[PDB]
mmCIF file of C-alpha atoms in Angstrom:
data_model
loop_
_atom_site.group_PDB
_atom_site.id
_atom_site.type_symbol
_atom_site.label_atom_id
_atom_site.label_comp_id
_atom_site.label_asym_id
_atom_site.label_seq_id
_atom_site.Cartn_x
_atom_site.Cartn_y
_atom_site.Cartn_z
ATOM 1 C CA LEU A 189 0.000 0.000 0.000
ATOM 2 C CA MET A 190 2.845 2.404 0.791
ATOM 3 C CA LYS A 191 4.447 1.556 -2.556
ATOM 4 C CA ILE A 192 1.274 2.128 -4.582
ATOM 5 C CA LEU A 193 0.492 5.346 -2.690
ATOM 6 C CA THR A 194 3.984 6.671 -3.428
ATOM 7 C CA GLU A 195 3.323 5.756 -7.063
ATOM 8 C CA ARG A 196 -0.017 7.606 -6.989
ATOM 9 C CA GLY A 197 1.745 10.639 -5.476
ATOM 10 C CA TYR A 198 1.467 10.185 -1.684
ATOM 11 C CA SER A 199 4.940 9.423 -0.319
ATOM 12 C CA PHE A 200 5.169 7.776 3.113
ATOM 13 C CA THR A 201 8.712 7.063 4.304
ATOM 14 C CA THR A 202 8.694 7.146 8.131
ATOM 15 C CA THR A 203 7.693 4.415 10.566
ATOM 16 C CA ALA A 204 4.965 6.698 11.940
ATOM 17 C CA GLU A 205 3.496 7.328 8.486
ATOM 18 C CA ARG A 206 3.615 3.550 8.075
ATOM 19 C CA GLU A 207 0.982 3.382 10.823
ATOM 20 C CA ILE A 208 -1.186 5.928 8.996
ATOM 21 C CA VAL A 209 -0.913 3.770 5.872
ATOM 22 C CA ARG A 210 -1.791 0.670 7.907
ATOM 23 C CA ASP A 211 -4.884 2.460 9.219
ATOM 24 C CA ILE A 212 -5.824 3.450 5.663
ATOM 25 C CA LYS A 213 -5.437 -0.208 4.678
ATOM 26 C CA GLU A 214 -7.627 -1.455 7.523
ATOM 27 C CA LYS A 215 -10.303 1.189 6.903
ATOM 28 C CA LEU A 216 -10.624 1.669 3.127
ATOM 29 C CA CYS A 217 -9.195 -1.424 1.408
ATOM 30 C CA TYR A 218 -11.414 -4.302 0.312
ATOM 31 C CA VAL A 219 -11.277 -7.448 -1.810
ATOM 32 C CA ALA A 220 -12.979 -7.131 -5.192
ATOM 33 C CA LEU A 221 -14.961 -9.995 -6.699
ATOM 34 C CA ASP A 222 -13.567 -9.376 -10.211
ATOM 35 C CA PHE A 223 -10.208 -7.600 -10.302
ATOM 36 C CA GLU A 224 -10.342 -6.735 -14.009
ATOM 37 C CA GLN A 225 -13.903 -5.397 -13.833
ATOM 38 C CA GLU A 226 -13.030 -3.396 -10.714
ATOM 39 C CA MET A 227 -9.972 -1.895 -12.421
ATOM 40 C CA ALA A 228 -12.101 -0.982 -15.439
ATOM 41 C CA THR A 229 -14.702 0.650 -13.185
ATOM 42 C CA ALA A 230 -12.023 2.597 -11.307
ATOM 43 C CA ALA A 231 -10.483 3.792 -14.580
ATOM 44 C CA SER A 232 -13.849 4.770 -16.102
ATOM 45 C CA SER A 233 -15.313 6.386 -12.961
ATOM 46 C CA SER A 234 -14.283 7.875 -9.618
ATOM 47 C CA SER A 235 -17.107 6.291 -7.593
ATOM 48 C CA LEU A 236 -14.569 3.867 -6.075
ATOM 49 C CA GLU A 237 -12.457 6.687 -4.608
ATOM 50 C CA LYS A 238 -12.556 7.687 -0.944
ATOM 51 C CA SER A 239 -11.266 10.531 1.218
ATOM 52 C CA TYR A 240 -8.905 10.099 4.165
ATOM 53 C CA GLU A 241 -7.867 12.788 6.654
ATOM 54 C CA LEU A 242 -4.265 12.629 7.851
ATOM 55 C CA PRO A 243 -3.231 13.620 11.398
ATOM 56 C CA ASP A 244 -2.270 17.069 10.038
ATOM 57 C CA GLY A 245 -5.709 17.735 8.521
ATOM 58 C CA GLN A 246 -4.763 17.092 4.881
ATOM 59 C CA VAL A 247 -7.434 15.191 2.938
ATOM 60 C CA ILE A 248 -6.007 12.670 0.468
ATOM 61 C CA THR A 249 -7.880 10.561 -2.084
ATOM 62 C CA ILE A 250 -7.454 6.779 -2.263
ATOM 63 C CA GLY A 251 -8.586 5.248 -5.547
ATOM 64 C CA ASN A 252 -7.935 1.850 -7.108
ATOM 65 C CA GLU A 253 -5.310 1.167 -4.426
ATOM 66 C CA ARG A 254 -8.120 0.090 -2.075
ATOM 67 C CA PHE A 255 -8.550 -3.175 -4.004
ATOM 68 C CA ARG A 256 -5.135 -3.297 -5.691
ATOM 69 C CA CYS A 257 -3.451 -3.743 -2.294
ATOM 70 C CA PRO A 258 -5.479 -6.713 -0.932
ATOM 71 C CA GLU A 259 -5.285 -8.265 -4.401
ATOM 72 C CA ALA A 260 -1.721 -9.330 -3.530
ATOM 73 C CA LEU A 261 -3.196 -12.162 -1.435
ATOM 74 C CA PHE A 262 -4.580 -13.765 -4.613
ATOM 75 C CA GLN A 263 -1.770 -12.701 -6.999
ATOM 76 C CA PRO A 264 1.595 -12.433 -5.202
ATOM 77 C CA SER A 265 3.082 -11.492 -8.595
ATOM 78 C CA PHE A 266 2.309 -7.862 -7.706
ATOM 79 C CA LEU A 267 4.760 -8.130 -4.790
ATOM 80 C CA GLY A 268 7.108 -10.320 -6.830
ATOM 81 C CA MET A 269 6.661 -13.549 -4.860
ATOM 82 C CA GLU A 270 6.744 -16.759 -6.910
ATOM 83 C CA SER A 271 4.027 -18.324 -4.778
ATOM 84 C CA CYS A 272 0.397 -19.258 -5.329
ATOM 85 C CA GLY A 273 -2.385 -17.104 -3.920
ATOM 86 C CA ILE A 274 -4.357 -17.919 -0.796
ATOM 87 C CA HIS A 275 -7.164 -19.606 -2.749
ATOM 88 C CA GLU A 276 -4.720 -21.731 -4.748
ATOM 89 C CA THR A 277 -2.889 -22.615 -1.528
ATOM 90 C CA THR A 278 -6.130 -23.732 0.126
ATOM 91 C CA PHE A 279 -6.956 -25.778 -2.979
ATOM 92 C CA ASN A 280 -3.519 -27.418 -2.993
ATOM 93 C CA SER A 281 -3.865 -28.249 0.707
ATOM 94 C CA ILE A 282 -7.286 -29.826 0.150
ATOM 95 C CA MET A 283 -5.732 -31.801 -2.712
ATOM 96 C CA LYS A 284 -2.819 -33.026 -0.576
ATOM 97 C CA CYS A 285 -5.440 -34.111 1.969
ATOM 98 C CA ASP A 286 -7.037 -37.532 1.610
ATOM 99 C CA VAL A 287 -9.828 -37.781 -0.954
ATOM 100 C CA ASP A 288 -12.320 -39.131 1.588
ATOM 101 C CA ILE A 289 -12.095 -35.886 3.605
ATOM 102 C CA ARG A 290 -11.927 -33.324 0.772
ATOM 103 C CA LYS A 291 -15.724 -33.016 0.783
ATOM 104 C CA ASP A 292 -15.775 -31.938 4.433
ATOM 105 C CA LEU A 293 -12.669 -29.777 3.986
ATOM 106 C CA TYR A 294 -14.485 -27.862 1.241
ATOM 107 C CA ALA A 295 -17.798 -27.713 3.113
ATOM 108 C CA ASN A 296 -16.097 -26.367 6.280
ATOM 109 C CA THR A 297 -13.662 -23.800 4.843
ATOM 110 C CA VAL A 298 -13.145 -21.267 7.651
ATOM 111 C CA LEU A 299 -11.384 -17.893 7.521
ATOM 112 C CA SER A 300 -9.365 -16.473 10.417
ATOM 113 C CA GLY A 301 -6.880 -13.727 11.197
ATOM 114 C CA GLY A 302 -6.943 -9.953 11.051
ATOM 115 C CA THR A 303 -5.854 -9.928 7.409
ATOM 116 C CA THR A 304 -9.066 -11.797 6.499
ATOM 117 C CA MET A 305 -11.201 -8.818 7.599
ATOM 118 C CA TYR A 306 -11.315 -7.254 4.125
ATOM 119 C CA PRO A 307 -14.900 -6.923 2.830
ATOM 120 C CA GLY A 308 -15.654 -9.301 -0.024
ATOM 121 C CA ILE A 309 -12.700 -11.580 0.739
ATOM 122 C CA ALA A 310 -15.147 -14.361 1.624
ATOM 123 C CA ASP A 311 -17.043 -13.996 -1.662
ATOM 124 C CA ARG A 312 -13.770 -13.932 -3.608
ATOM 125 C CA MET A 313 -12.543 -17.080 -1.847
ATOM 126 C CA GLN A 314 -15.902 -18.743 -2.529
ATOM 127 C CA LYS A 315 -15.708 -17.878 -6.230
ATOM 128 C CA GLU A 316 -12.093 -18.999 -6.604
ATOM 129 C CA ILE A 317 -12.474 -22.285 -4.719
ATOM 130 C CA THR A 318 -15.664 -23.088 -6.637
ATOM 131 C CA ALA A 319 -13.871 -22.429 -9.930
ATOM 132 C CA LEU A 320 -10.837 -24.504 -8.901
ATOM 133 C CA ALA A 321 -12.503 -27.450 -7.146
ATOM 134 C CA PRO A 322 -14.499 -30.217 -8.856
ATOM 135 C CA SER A 323 -18.115 -29.466 -9.736
ATOM 136 C CA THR A 324 -19.302 -32.224 -7.366
ATOM 137 C CA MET A 325 -17.793 -30.541 -4.271
ATOM 138 C CA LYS A 326 -20.056 -28.101 -2.436
ATOM 139 C CA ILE A 327 -17.960 -25.074 -1.460
ATOM 140 C CA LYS A 328 -18.797 -23.033 1.643
ATOM 141 C CA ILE A 329 -16.645 -20.225 3.046
ATOM 142 C CA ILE A 330 -17.122 -19.438 6.744
ATOM 143 C CA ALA A 331 -16.146 -15.901 7.805
ATOM 144 C CA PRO A 332 -17.457 -15.147 11.302
ATOM 145 C CA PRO A 333 -17.862 -11.430 12.065
ATOM 146 C CA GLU A 334 -15.371 -11.776 14.939
ATOM 147 C CA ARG A 335 -12.947 -13.964 12.968
ATOM 148 C CA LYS A 336 -10.171 -11.572 14.014
ATOM 149 C CA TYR A 337 -10.513 -13.034 17.533
ATOM 150 C CA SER A 338 -11.400 -16.649 16.653
ATOM 151 C CA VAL A 339 -7.973 -17.793 17.869
ATOM 152 C CA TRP A 340 -8.443 -16.443 21.394
ATOM 153 C CA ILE A 341 -12.106 -17.478 21.368
ATOM 154 C CA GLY A 342 -11.205 -21.100 20.690
ATOM 155 C CA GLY A 343 -8.392 -20.939 23.220
ATOM 156 C CA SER A 344 -10.777 -19.702 25.908
ATOM 157 C CA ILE A 345 -13.358 -22.337 24.955
ATOM 158 C CA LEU A 346 -10.780 -25.121 25.216
ATOM 159 C CA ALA A 347 -9.427 -23.753 28.510
ATOM 160 C CA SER A 348 -12.928 -23.492 30.015
ATOM 161 C CA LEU A 349 -14.061 -26.961 28.910
ATOM 162 C CA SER A 350 -13.905 -29.367 31.847
ATOM 163 C CA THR A 351 -12.701 -32.389 29.856
ATOM 164 C CA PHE A 352 -9.593 -30.348 28.945
ATOM 165 C CA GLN A 353 -8.384 -30.226 32.569
ATOM 166 C CA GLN A 354 -6.462 -33.478 31.987
ATOM 167 C CA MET A 355 -4.531 -31.996 29.037
ATOM 168 C CA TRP A 356 -2.599 -29.292 30.910
ATOM 169 C CA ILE A 357 1.118 -29.706 31.575
ATOM 170 C CA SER A 358 1.581 -29.546 35.342
ATOM 171 C CA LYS A 359 4.609 -28.206 37.189
ATOM 172 C CA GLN A 360 5.325 -31.747 38.393
ATOM 173 C CA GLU A 361 5.240 -33.172 34.866
ATOM 174 C CA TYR A 362 7.546 -30.359 33.747
ATOM 175 C CA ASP A 363 10.058 -30.890 36.555
ATOM 176 C CA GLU A 364 9.988 -34.623 35.783
ATOM 177 C CA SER A 365 10.204 -34.715 31.970
ATOM 178 C CA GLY A 366 11.953 -31.439 31.111
ATOM 179 C CA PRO A 367 10.720 -28.963 28.501
ATOM 180 C CA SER A 368 10.295 -31.893 26.094
ATOM 181 C CA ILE A 369 6.997 -32.667 27.863
ATOM 182 C CA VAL A 370 5.464 -30.196 25.400
ATOM 183 C CA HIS A 371 6.206 -32.609 22.547
ATOM 184 C CA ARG A 372 4.145 -35.230 24.421
ATOM 185 C CA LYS A 373 1.281 -33.151 25.868
ATOM 186 C CA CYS A 374 0.672 -30.459 23.191
ATOM 187 C CA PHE A 375 -0.370 -31.484 19.682
ATOM 188 C CA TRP O 146 26.669 -91.598 2.134
ATOM 189 C CA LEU O 147 29.226 -88.974 3.217
ATOM 190 C CA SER O 148 30.040 -87.473 -0.195
ATOM 191 C CA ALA O 149 26.500 -86.157 -0.670
ATOM 192 C CA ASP O 150 26.513 -85.121 2.996
ATOM 193 C CA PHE O 151 29.356 -82.619 2.592
ATOM 194 C CA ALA O 152 27.829 -81.318 -0.643
ATOM 195 C CA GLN O 153 24.511 -80.962 1.186
ATOM 196 C CA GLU O 154 26.118 -79.468 4.297
ATOM 197 C CA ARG O 155 27.944 -76.932 2.117
ATOM 198 C CA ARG O 156 24.738 -75.728 0.451
ATOM 199 C CA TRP O 157 23.043 -75.801 3.860
ATOM 200 C CA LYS O 158 25.894 -73.925 5.549
ATOM 201 C CA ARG O 159 26.056 -71.212 2.885
ATOM 202 C CA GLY O 160 22.267 -71.096 3.189
ATOM 203 C CA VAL O 161 22.360 -71.019 7.038
ATOM 204 C CA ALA O 162 25.104 -68.333 7.334
ATOM 205 C CA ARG O 163 23.241 -66.587 4.472
ATOM 206 C CA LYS O 164 19.895 -66.261 6.360
ATOM 207 C CA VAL O 165 21.958 -65.337 9.495
ATOM 208 C CA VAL O 166 23.648 -62.258 7.918
ATOM 209 C CA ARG O 167 20.140 -61.792 6.413
ATOM 210 C CA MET O 168 18.118 -61.349 9.661
ATOM 211 C CA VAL O 169 21.198 -59.250 10.604
ATOM 212 C CA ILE O 170 20.159 -56.801 7.842
ATOM 213 C CA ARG O 171 16.526 -57.057 8.926
ATOM 214 C CA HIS O 172 17.607 -56.437 12.525
ATOM 215 C CA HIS O 173 19.490 -53.263 11.598
ATOM 216 C CA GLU O 174 16.479 -52.394 9.452
ATOM 217 C CA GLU O 175 14.400 -53.172 12.550
ATOM 218 C CA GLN O 176 16.457 -50.636 14.519
ATOM 219 C CA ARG O 177 15.702 -47.924 11.976
ATOM 220 C CA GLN O 178 12.225 -49.454 11.912
ATOM 221 C CA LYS O 179 12.343 -49.289 15.719
ATOM 222 C CA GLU O 180 12.887 -45.526 15.510
ATOM 223 C CA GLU O 181 10.069 -45.371 12.959
ATOM 224 C CA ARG O 182 7.833 -47.293 15.382
ATOM 225 C CA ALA O 183 8.713 -44.768 18.083
ATOM 226 C CA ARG O 184 7.692 -42.044 15.625
ATOM 227 C CA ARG O 185 4.439 -43.938 15.029
ATOM 228 C CA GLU O 186 3.898 -44.036 18.801
ATOM 229 C CA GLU O 187 4.405 -40.267 18.858
ATOM 230 C CA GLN O 188 1.804 -39.975 16.090
ATOM 231 C CA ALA O 189 -0.517 -42.219 18.114
ATOM 232 C CA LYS O 190 -0.179 -39.878 21.094
ATOM 233 C CA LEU O 191 -0.939 -37.070 18.639
ATOM 234 C CA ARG O 192 -4.094 -38.912 17.570
ATOM 235 C CA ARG O 193 -5.162 -39.561 21.172
#
């Protein structure tokens, strides 16, 4: 985002301005369903532009960058990484998985992490995985509203469950088996 | 009686020593396979 804003004409070079650019990313960026159509719309109209006020009161205009930045998750070629996108990576993982479980892996595709908070990312993942996977596999993307906290939510659930009380590594077990007790009790 | 015996004992001996060095290879293989069985036990703890 900093790179494309410098290209557009807004140069951010300091670590503090990096935080302003991160805030702009979190607030205005979004995943487009069709990158080519979105680029055409942005080039033929300004309806996709937005205004952002900097800490000094200057109002800048963010245009196609909003969806050109998050697009790097599906096409790392923009950043120059010879790696498949997130959708292709999920597809390759489901392929490496056993055939008998690919149906459930498709049906229970879940999104997590702060980076997955872009609007439309779930629809884009749905589209891509449906286009890549066999026609007989029902695709379903799960993007909870609080997916940014799903990690801690599941941790708290597992720590509050009573049946999990036998899974903890106790001080006695640690003093007896050394730090390696993690490789036996945590999986 | 004894001529065929030595000829038989030779083929038996080279067969006996043969299978001996043989299980020797399987034993060493079983030691690497012993480490692989320990890894499988780790995976079984994982599964549990």
